[PDB]
Amino acid sequence: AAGQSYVRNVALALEAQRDPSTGALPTHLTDCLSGFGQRPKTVTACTITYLNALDYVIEASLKVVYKSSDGTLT
Amino acid sequence: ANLAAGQSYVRNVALALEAQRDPSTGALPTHLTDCLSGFGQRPKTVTACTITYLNALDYVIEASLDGAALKKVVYKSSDGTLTSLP
Amino acid sequence: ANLAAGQSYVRNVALALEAQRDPSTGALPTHLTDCLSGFGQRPKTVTACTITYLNALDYVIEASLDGAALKKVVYKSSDGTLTSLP
Numbered sequence: 001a002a003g004q005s006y007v008r009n010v011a012l013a014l015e016a017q018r019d020p021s022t023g024a025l026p027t028h029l030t031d032c033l034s035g036f037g038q039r040p041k042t043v044t045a046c047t048i049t050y051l052n053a054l055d056y057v058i059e060a061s062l063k064v065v066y067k068s069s070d071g072t073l074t
Numbered sequence: 075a076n077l078a079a080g081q082s083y084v085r086n087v088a089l090a091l092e093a094q095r096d097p098s099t100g101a102l103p104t105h106l107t108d109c110l111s112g113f114g115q116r117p118k119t120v121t122a123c124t125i126t127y128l129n130a131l132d133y134v135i136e137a138s139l140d141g142a143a144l145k146k147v148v149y150k151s152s153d154g155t156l157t158s159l160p
Numbered sequence: 161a162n163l164a165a166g167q168s169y170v171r172n173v174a175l176a177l178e179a180q181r182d183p184s185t186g187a188l189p190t191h192l193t194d195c196l197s198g199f200g201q202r203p204k205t206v207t208a209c210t211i212t213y214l215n216a217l218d219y220v221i222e223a224s225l226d227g228a229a230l231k232k233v234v235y236k237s238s239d240g241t242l243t244s245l246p
């Protein structure tokens with residue numbers, strides 16, 4: 001699971017793009033097939049869902065799910 | 075670069091805490107409230123460091139710096155913000 | 161003096177990272193991979209900043225600058241080199 005590591009790196013990248021005073025994420029960035037460095041070929045689908053301006057869920061098919069709100073990876 | 079050494083230490087404490095979450099529930103061990111020790115090398119500019127748990131998922135790190143461009147750093151896990159104050 | 165401001169920022173990132181080394185082993189925490197925050201005041205010329213760890217001791221900082229005499233600056237801890245105009 002090179003896929004898991006990629007997902008964690010997408011999350012880290014998203015954390016770095018938060019507004020530094022409010023925490024808000026740009027909520028139109030919903031694709032993580034590109035724009036997050038080298039993607040291992042095992043990752044065939046990657047979407048970011050924003051639940052509000054702070055919280056996101058990354059879903060990747062290789063299925064793995066990262067939730068920013070609780071920091072869990074499944 | 076004391077302010078930078080302090081801030082970066084705080085970010086490293088947060089990353090360490092993230093790694094210690096329960097992998098199914100996300101819960102943190104909420105008795106770990108001191109960050110003066112237990113998080114690797116602490117730059118000497120950091121003279122106070124406390125972690126406050128607002129619930130089982132969310133924490134706030136507060137650090138005080140000596141001889142730095144600012145005095146207090148606060149990191150909030152819930153919104154991912156880092157603030158620094160004189 | 162944007163190139164100078166970006167260069168100065170990168171050097172401050174490096175100095176901050178040095179402060180986090182274990183003083184017996186030299187090892188750094190290797191999950192702090194961006195330097196857009198947590199390293200003091202960042203000049204607005206610095207639009208991207210990443211830290212790559214090549215092993216537990218050695219890192220490379222890459223920063224992208226806009227409106228500067230160079231576009232990218234790179235610091236390597238192993239050789240202490242920083243992009244400089246000849």
